[PDB]
Design an enzyme around this catalytic site. Structure first.
Site, mmCIF file in Angstrom:
data_model
loop_
_atom_site.group_PDB
_atom_site.id
_atom_site.type_symbol
_atom_site.label_atom_id
_atom_site.label_comp_id
_atom_site.label_asym_id
_atom_site.label_seq_id
_atom_site.Cartn_x
_atom_site.Cartn_y
_atom_site.Cartn_z
ATOM 1 N N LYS B 92 -40.313 -13.921 73.557
ATOM 2 C CA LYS B 92 -40.000 -14.723 72.383
ATOM 3 C C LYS B 92 -41.145 -14.584 71.390
ATOM 4 C CE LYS B 92 -37.127 -17.649 70.417
ATOM 5 N NZ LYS B 92 -37.343 -16.790 69.180
ATOM 6 N N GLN B 113 -48.965 -15.594 71.464
ATOM 7 C CA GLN B 113 -47.599 -16.128 71.675
ATOM 8 C C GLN B 113 -47.302 -16.541 73.095
ATOM 9 O OE1 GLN B 113 -45.887 -16.290 68.035
ATOM 10 N NE2 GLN B 113 -44.776 -16.692 69.939
ATOM 11 N N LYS B 116 -49.002 -20.104 73.668
ATOM 12 C CA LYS B 116 -48.399 -21.123 72.809
ATOM 13 C C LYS B 116 -46.991 -21.439 73.301
ATOM 14 C CE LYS B 116 -51.222 -20.012 68.836
ATOM 15 N NZ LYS B 116 -52.314 -20.195 69.815
ATOM 16 N N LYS B 128 -43.903 -10.064 70.127
ATOM 17 C CA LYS B 128 -44.082 -10.034 68.698
ATOM 18 C C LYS B 128 -43.704 -8.650 68.213
ATOM 19 C CE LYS B 128 -45.702 -12.426 65.114
ATOM 20 N NZ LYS B 128 -45.707 -13.900 64.862
ATOM 21 N N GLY B 167 -38.202 -14.924 62.783
ATOM 22 C CA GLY B 167 -38.876 -14.473 61.569
ATOM 23 C C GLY B 167 -40.384 -14.749 61.584
ATOM 24 N N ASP B 168 -41.003 -14.395 60.468
ATOM 25 C CA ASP B 168 -42.442 -14.547 60.240
ATOM 26 C C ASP B 168 -42.610 -14.013 58.821
ATOM 27 O OD1 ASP B 168 -45.239 -14.744 60.556
ATOM 28 O OD2 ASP B 168 -45.328 -13.302 62.174
ATOM 29 N N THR B 212 -42.054 -28.104 62.377
ATOM 30 C CA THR B 212 -43.526 -27.989 62.514
ATOM 31 C C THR B 212 -44.235 -29.233 61.980
ATOM 32 O OG1 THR B 212 -43.427 -25.575 62.537
ATOM 33 C CG2 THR B 212 -45.581 -26.567 61.985
ATOM 34 N N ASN B 243 -43.822 -26.183 53.514
ATOM 35 C CA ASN B 243 -42.910 -26.537 54.597
ATOM 36 C C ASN B 243 -43.504 -27.537 55.608
ATOM 37 O OD1 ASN B 243 -41.874 -25.318 57.605
ATOM 38 N ND2 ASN B 243 -40.338 -26.144 56.189
ATOM 39 N N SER B 379 -37.123 -23.441 68.074
ATOM 40 C CA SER B 379 -36.557 -22.113 68.350
ATOM 41 C C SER B 379 -35.914 -22.119 69.741
ATOM 42 C CB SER B 379 -37.593 -20.976 68.179
ATOM 43 O OG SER B 379 -38.354 -20.722 69.349
HETATM 44 N N1 LIG Z 1 -43.917 -23.384 58.402
HETATM 45 C C1 LIG Z 1 -44.100 -23.031 59.669
HETATM 46 O O1 LIG Z 1 -43.315 -23.317 60.578
HETATM 47 C C2 LIG Z 1 -45.255 -22.295 59.934
HETATM 48 C C3 LIG Z 1 -46.485 -22.606 59.345
HETATM 49 N N2 LIG Z 1 -47.613 -21.814 59.676
HETATM 50 C C4 LIG Z 1 -48.943 -22.095 59.077
HETATM 51 O O2 LIG Z 1 -48.946 -23.413 58.504
HETATM 52 C C5 LIG Z 1 -49.666 -23.369 57.239
HETATM 53 C C6 LIG Z 1 -48.673 -23.719 56.112
HETATM 54 O O3 LIG Z 1 -47.433 -23.051 56.383
HETATM 55 P P1 LIG Z 1 -46.186 -23.182 55.384
HETATM 56 O O4 LIG Z 1 -46.132 -24.717 55.055
HETATM 57 O O5 LIG Z 1 -44.958 -22.639 56.042
HETATM 58 O O6 LIG Z 1 -46.605 -22.347 54.097
HETATM 59 P P2 LIG Z 1 -46.028 -22.661 52.612
HETATM 60 O O7 LIG Z 1 -46.040 -21.387 51.852
HETATM 61 O O8 LIG Z 1 -44.556 -23.306 52.784
HETATM 62 O O9 LIG Z 1 -46.880 -23.875 52.002
HETATM 63 C C7 LIG Z 1 -48.301 -23.705 51.934
HETATM 64 C C8 LIG Z 1 -48.946 -24.800 51.094
HETATM 65 O O10 LIG Z 1 -50.387 -24.694 51.266
HETATM 66 C C9 LIG Z 1 -50.967 -24.756 49.930
HETATM 67 N N3 LIG Z 1 -52.344 -24.222 50.002
HETATM 68 C C10 LIG Z 1 -52.703 -22.975 50.282
HETATM 69 N N4 LIG Z 1 -54.034 -22.925 50.265
HETATM 70 C C11 LIG Z 1 -54.500 -24.140 49.994
HETATM 71 C C12 LIG Z 1 -55.750 -24.615 49.873
HETATM 72 N N5 LIG Z 1 -56.741 -23.742 50.057
HETATM 73 N N6 LIG Z 1 -55.993 -25.905 49.591
HETATM 74 C C13 LIG Z 1 -54.916 -26.788 49.415
HETATM 75 N N7 LIG Z 1 -53.626 -26.254 49.545
HETATM 76 C C14 LIG Z 1 -53.450 -24.951 49.832
HETATM 77 C C15 LIG Z 1 -49.992 -23.914 49.150
HETATM 78 O O11 LIG Z 1 -50.201 -24.082 47.745
HETATM 79 P P3 LIG Z 1 -50.058 -22.808 46.781
HETATM 80 O O12 LIG Z 1 -48.528 -22.863 46.269
HETATM 81 O O13 LIG Z 1 -50.978 -23.207 45.525
HETATM 82 O O14 LIG Z 1 -50.424 -21.489 47.344
HETATM 83 C C16 LIG Z 1 -48.700 -24.580 49.597
HETATM 84 O O15 LIG Z 1 -48.610 -25.866 49.012
HETATM 85 C C17 LIG Z 1 -50.233 -21.952 57.136
HETATM 86 O O16 LIG Z 1 -51.542 -21.958 57.778
HETATM 87 C C18 LIG Z 1 -49.242 -21.136 57.936
HETATM 88 O O17 LIG Z 1 -49.814 -19.909 58.456
HETATM 89 C C19 LIG Z 1 -47.506 -20.741 60.577
HETATM 90 C C20 LIG Z 1 -46.275 -20.444 61.160
HETATM 91 C C21 LIG Z 1 -45.172 -21.224 60.819
#
Ligand SMILES: NC(=O)C1=CN([C@@H]2O[C@H](COP(=O)(O)OP(=O)(O)OC[C@H]3O[C@@H](n4cnc5c(N)ncnc54)[C@H](OP(=O)(O)O)[C@@H]3O)[C@@H](O)[C@H]2O)C=CC1
Ligand SMILES: NC(=O)C1=CN([C@@H]2O[C@H](COP(=O)(O)OP(=O)(O)OC[C@H]3O[C@@H](n4cnc5c(N)ncnc54)[C@H](OP(=O)(O)O)[C@@H]3O)[C@@H](O)[C@H]2O)C=CC1
Ligand SMILES: NC(=O)C1=CN([C@@H]2O[C@H](COP(=O)(O)OP(=O)(O)OC[C@H]3O[C@@H](n4cnc5c(N)ncnc54)[C@H](OP(=O)(O)O)[C@@H]3O)[C@@H](O)[C@H]2O)C=CC1
Ligand SMILES: NC(=O)C1=CN([C@@H]2O[C@H](COP(=O)(O)OP(=O)(O)OC[C@H]3O[C@@H](n4cnc5c(N)ncnc54)[C@H](OP(=O)(O)O)[C@@H]3O)[C@@H](O)[C@H]2O)C=CC1
Ligand SMILES: N=C(CCC(=O)O)C(=O)O
Ligand SMILES: N=C(CCC(=O)O)C(=O)O
Ligand SMILES: N=C(CCC(=O)O)C(=O)O
Ligand SMILES: [K+]
Ligand SMILES: [K+]
Ligand SMILES: [K+]
Ligand SMILES: [K+]
Ligand SMILES: [K+]
Ligand SMILES: [K+]
Ligand SMILES: [K+]
Ligand SMILES: [K+]
Lengths: 446, 447, 447, 447
Positions: B92, B113, B116, B128, B167-168, B212, B243, B379
């Protein structure tokens, strides 16, 4: 006439199956019960139904070459009898014991058809094993044996095809090696291929306990049918393996006292009850003889003489192997006031043993009814796997209790339906047969 | 001769077999550091070459992906699928399409993976994949044709019990649709369980979007109870506004806490009486605007460009934005302000210096490994729904997610204490993820 | 201990594992006697449990065969396929439909087949199968339904490289047609190499119909020439009246001998002036009648139900019916009456007592695994023709068959001499057949 | 937009995708120099991204190979199979078991294999595989168990029309036996065409053992005759002492040359009066001993640990050991000492500097993809025999091999001259090998 029709077919069967006494033994008792149903409902012989039923759909025998820790090549024989699939996938255990041959596997597989039918769950009947003797073998030797065995077996099994499990000589250790190697052969994580799996890789809670627990759940149902209490009762539980261990555990949880258990070397007397934790340690950690239990437990007497059935008891639960309780043991038992027998083992009581129980008013629970707790819990493992779910111990134990009560009910109601009140052998065989037969009629000549 | 010596010896050999893969090396080094603690107590965890087996992928597939652009020009990219470990269930893990993808990156992420996924408590192994295909500037038809070429090879190696990708980066709902459709064409069967992240009307799961963020809050709620406290009536900071942050805010407030701030790359917002989730989503998903646009319209909320979101006095901090967003200085500010709890919704948002500050200042820390596992948990819930041919309600699914997060917390807490590290959830998460895989591998023999 | 003791001890164990199979014990016993000789000289041949692997079938299939007769009555017969050894090639051997069939008989035949097939020099493993179905009295549609039910199970276990059946007692061109048609229906492909004994316009080989009986006569001619005699002018008994017997008679009479008797299971016919092959063929193949009918229709032929065909004074006896049809009393009668050569067209027709009489009385004796191997050799030629999508002339194929039978004779004679048992073709056949299989088994490992 | 610029830009992209694989880069670069020559005359050969497709393997498998030693310790090695190109036939190429083995090495060999296979004129694509398993010092059972674990994974990816492996360094008849046995056990069929280098009694070909070395000598004979010389009476160095080196020595001396030196990885032996083939075979095949032991037991032979085998004065050098065993420095020495001919038994033994020296000093040079092709050609002949269920004589097969090597020489010389590079057999081999593959790729579309 019906009696002669069936007798003449049995004769034919003896000829095609020369030298398989255990299979003849299993078949005989079933067809005796089948005579009753044919007198009332003759359509059950329609379309060569009995002729089909008694001939396995498929039988596999195969070479299992393996190499010991000294680099010596050994050859054993493997078996898988896929007897009947009318109600669901072939389902039944694997036995590794030097006694194993095709006739024995056919007996177990034939019995398994009706046992599995009785659970009410969607499972057909099969069985397999090997004349491999796991005793004295290292874990690496056992592992290589299981890997060789599964190298052939994997092409004949599968979640909907045939779902094996353990039995004598095949425990959690062996199911682990068999399952891992299956995945390697098939290149897929098909949890539904086997039952008896480990709790962290698709197993079911209660499965380890199931057969022994349900045996006791069944015997308690026969006991309460006589207006009696299992609490306060003296119980013999022969064997000291998976079924006996947990039969003893449930028994003593219920207020009863287990006064004896055994292995194939001898038997131990425990007038004040068994230490479950002690025994499990001797059998599962040390893989030792029961005499070691006696050596270390105050007031436990090891016996190499006589029989475990020489002990005065109210209840006997044979949980070791076929034909371990004979006509003479049955008399000894009733003379000392034994009141109910219920089989944890497959076919432990000889034909004359069963005859004595009837003559002496001993209530008798046949294995296909009494030990069905195992395969029923295996069907629950299959259900959990099918839905990728994992049930609690309580929930699973509750379902097992319900199934055992359902089996008792079915045996009682059918036996009475055919004018054989309280004959659970008649009830079990007729009820197991009719469900299979109806399905076979529906699915055509196949 | 000693434990240290035999492990170091092996790590050295791993370096040689896996030349030029420093991320994978570091991931392995981190795991080996966890095994040390385990071997010290129970050596049997190295029996039968267990570590040597664990650190070598069961299988790795690399393949040509030829595709044709909208101008009729043939391009060639490389595809990957590392099927690392299947002890606990089907492989997975996600698929990433980005120029940075190569085998060492896939092995690194695939290895991580395994543990986790193990830690979720659910029957999933680890893998992956992806491609060095760059989706940027590509048309929908070009991306479709790429997905179709990719799955023409991939389909034979995957399946409901074999390998279930997701996805990713570079592989979202659009790509999952194209990959699933073409899988069915290759296989000639409508095998829902082959992929997760699917559309709601063709085998997808509710709560996936929320997973998440929700899971992080469920995890932190358990941390809070472990201290005799409750999450209701506490004040919470949630960084980011994507997200993870959106749904972290939604859940925390559902559970009766008040959220006081959020952010994007540009700046951060103080919302001392709570966030308007509806407003935020509209700003970010519909208008794709900055968080400043938000502050103007709510009476009591103020915007800020100077300093850091972490300056706000809080009880709980949930970094949900990006790696390395919460540094040692931030950690110090939070602790001085009385923050008692940090849990990670983002990927490694706390810097190693911040992590040591929480330890020094007695802040309870929920590492992302555990706290952000809601996504992978859901998932598995999609797999379970597909397996039973059922589509669960939002509420039932969310309830199941909460139970899963509670159990992840329990496993971290129990395991940590087992090894003399009471209330250290990173130790607990590291050891528990390893031991479940290891136990299953020992049971299943040399394979 | 001594080789004799080791081999005897192994045999004892085998009698226990395989209780109730006297024909299998008989077949094994004579091979193991010859193997003592090879083991005395070259003990390496027992290495790696080679004998233990050799005497245990790779696979055995037993299965239910339900079928409906012309009155609508359901019958159940038992089906068998023993896949004994595949070291030299796909399992190869025929199918027997006769009410005597059981697993023991199929195992004897499959075991013998390993060595027979080895002796041809062609790349074929050994196997056998059949059913207790009795084809006598059945209509064509009943035979067809039986064959279709049989192949409904058998198809999944066979294939051009897996297992290639053919006929034997009760399975002739009719049955092969219905078996092959249904295989193609089950497999959805026209896989000619799945079966041999096929019809000439759908992938069969010229000479295959004649092959076993012609080959038996080619072999006995070599035996006769080795004694400085010639087959022309000799009197020959050919028992049976099926595929093997018919063509042994044809070739014997072509080469100038006269066949003085033949038989079926009901009785025997004395033909002091030779056999009218055309009349015999019409009676057996068209009318499916008893040999008594030949006697009725042919001046000078006499039918008998008394005594034995082996009571006829002869030069050469060719038993071509079935196992254990020529016993110790028969062997003595043949010897006393002047018989100098016995060659087996049937499988294992001579009982152990008969074989000892031939030895003691200096009667030259060609064992079935050598003398009847022309059938399976020509099946391998059918396989070769199919593999190359070629169709050879009768003359080319018969020339190849002649060379093979001469090669088999030379191998038996030379191997017998090499091991100090000159002119003992049993020893020569068993040793030469065994060595090729054993060498291939050693090379291919423990499998 | 220039041909050099076009091809150079692609090479740069190949470099970044395949970082850390210098041998693969080495092999690709030299082929690309020839493709520039092709494209200058015929630019259509780059149509539809042909070169981009050619240089990226269709599929690559890397996998865990767990196995247990005689002491019951579990070991883990890495296995590989690179399925490079299948335009002309099933993937075809050997298996190398040696501790140096990694993906880049397997990729170099698989890439070279495409063009080598093309040049044979026979219907075979290109592939290669192997493991970092070191067979040196292992017992027969250890080797058996390793092969069985290797094939437990490999079997699903190979087959008569899919991929047909064989031996290479460290993989000889012993290994092929265990691999083939286990393949049949996995597939449950006797599929002879799955492997080549099989044994004589289980589907092997005569000449295959001798073929590579014989073919190298046949090729060098053609080079020699083209210069108006003849091979008889010449002095030859043959580096290595394995399958290739052994039979190059045998054929060279049969043809009247004297081999004055051979070697292994430990050192070299000087044999001024020629090599005793039977002795070398005894030492290397039965004893698996060092070349120094040859020098011990043979009068006139001397072992060396100083210098290089390449400082023996010779007329002809045949490097038959491994890649990059003959450098620019060795090449200068060879020439200074009067070497006029070099032909490669090994894959890529001469470094690019060595090959420049040969050009510069008027030494005729046969590249391995031409000179060593006799091995794989004879594998294709084994496949043909298996497909047609025939077994050819040694003489027939060797005469086919002779014809193939002459044809390969002619194709190389003629193609070299056609493109203005007279006597440059590297250009001839690369261009001829490439064009056949490319024309077939163009016909078969974007796949
Ligand atoms: N959603 C998930 O299920 C998953 C999340 N992750 C991890 O979780 C984190 C967020 O994921 P996700 O929410 O999906 O990503 P998104 O693209 O949906 O949202 C990211 C948010 O973080 C903001 N941001 C980025 N850098 C900074 C900063 N330096 N200071 C303050 N805000 C910042 C972005 O703003 P801006 O628009 O200005 O860039 C945006 O608001 C990441 O580390 C990602 O790798 C990993 C796998 C899955
Ligand atoms: N496990 C299951 O789920 C189910 C098992 N059964 C039946 O229950 C019985 C026991 O099974 P299980 O407990 O799983 O097997 P185990 O191998 O775990 O235990 C078998 C026990 O019986 C003894 N035994 C075995 N063979 C003989 C023999 N030939 N004569 C005397 N004693 C013998 C063994 O002693 P020793 O060590 O000395 O050999 C051991 O104490 C069998 O008849 C089995 O078919 C029925 C339903 C379910
Ligand atoms: N056909 C082949 O290619 C080969 C066959 N063989 C062996 O040759 C022998 C004959 O085979 P084949 O000719 O093909 O078979 P057929 O069915 O064509 O003919 C068998 C003949 O033998 C008689 N017979 C069969 N069973 C018995 C019996 N139990 N007691 C007395 N007579 C019997 C039959 O008479 P009735 O009709 O009365 O039963 C019939 O005349 C068998 O041992 C077979 O295994 C060996 C090599 C090849
Ligand atoms: N076998 C075939 O059919 C074909 C092989 N080839 C190529 O031929 C070459 C040899 O193959 P093959 O003979 O089958 O392999 P083998 O394993 O049978 O023999 C290899 C020989 O090379 C020696 N060797 C290795 N490295 C060196 C070195 N650096 N200096 C001197 N000797 C060395 C080995 O010695 P040591 O024991 O000390 O390692 C051994 O004597 C390889 O390049 C292979 O790819 C090409 C076409 C066909
Ligand atoms: N050994 C068992 C249990 C079989 C099973 O769980 O399939 C039996 O019913 O005898
Ligand atoms: N009946 C045969 C031949 C069957 C075959 O040609 O495979 C025999 O050798 O007994
Ligand atoms: N090792 C070989 C021969 C491979 C083969 O025969 O497939 C080579 O060409 O390098
Ligand atoms: K299967
Ligand atoms: K399901
Ligand atoms: K698939
Ligand atoms: K088939
Ligand atoms: K004569
Ligand atoms: K007459
Ligand atoms: K295959
Ligand atoms: K010369």
């Amino acid at each position: 006439t019906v009696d002669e029709q069936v007798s003449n077919y049995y004769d034919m069967l003896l000829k095609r199956n020369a030298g398989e006494p255990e299979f003849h033994q299993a078949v005989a008792e079933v067809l005796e019960s089948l005579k009753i149903v044919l007198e009332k409902d003759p359509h059950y012989a329609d379309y060569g139904l009995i002729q089909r039923l008694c001939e396995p759909e498929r039988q596999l025998i195969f070479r299992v070459p393996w190499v010991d820790d000294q680099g010596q090549v050994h050859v054993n024989r493997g078996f898988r009898v896929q007897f009947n699939s009318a109600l669901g996938p072939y389902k039944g255990g694997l036995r590794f014991h030097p006694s194993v041959n095709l006739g024995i596997v056919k007996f177990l597989g034939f019995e398994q058809i009706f046992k599995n039918s009785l659970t009410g769950l969607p499972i057909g009947g099969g069985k397999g094993g090997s004349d491999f003797d796991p005793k004295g073998k290292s874990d690496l030797e056992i592992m290589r044996f299981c890997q060789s065995f599964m190298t052939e077996l994997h092409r004949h099994i599968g979640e909907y095809r045939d779902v094996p499990a353990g039995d004598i000589g095949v425990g959690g250790r062996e199911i682990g090696y068999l399952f891992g190697h299956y995945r390697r052969m098939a290149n897929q994580h098909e949890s539904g291929v086997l039952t008896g799996k480990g709790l962290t890789w698709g197993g079911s809670l209660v499965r380890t306990e199931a057969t022994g627990y349900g045996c006791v759940y069944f015997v308690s149902e026969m006991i309460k049918a006589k207006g009696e209490s299992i609490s306060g009762q003296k119980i013999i539980v022969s064997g000291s393996g998976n079924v006996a261990t947990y039969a003893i555990e449930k028994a003593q949880e219920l207020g009863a006292t287990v006064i004896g258990f055994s292995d194939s070397s001898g038997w131990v007397h425990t007038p004040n009850g068994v230490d479950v934790a002690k025994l499990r340690e001797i059998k599962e950690v040390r893989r030792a003889r029961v005499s070691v239990y006696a050596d270390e437990i105050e007031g436990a007497t090891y016996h190499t003489d006589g029989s475990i059935w020489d002990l005065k008891c109210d209840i006997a639960l044979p949980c070791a192997t076929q034909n371990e309780l004979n006509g003479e043991n049955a008399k000894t038992l009733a003379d000392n006031g034994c009141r109910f027998v219920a089989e944890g083992a497959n076919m432990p009581s000889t034909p004359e043993a069963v005859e004595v129980f009837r003559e002496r008013d001993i209530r008798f629970g046949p294995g296909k009814a009494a030990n069905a707790g195992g395969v029923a819990t295996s069907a629950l493992e299959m259900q959990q796997n099918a839905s990728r779910d994992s049930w609690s111990f309580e929930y699973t134990d509750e379902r097992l209790q319900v199934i055992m009560k359902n089996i008792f009910k079915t045996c009682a109601e059918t036996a009475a339906e055919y004018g054989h009140e309280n004959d659970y052998v008649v009830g079990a065989n007729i009820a197991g047969f009719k469900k299979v037969a109806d399905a076979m009629l529906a699915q055509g000549v196949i």
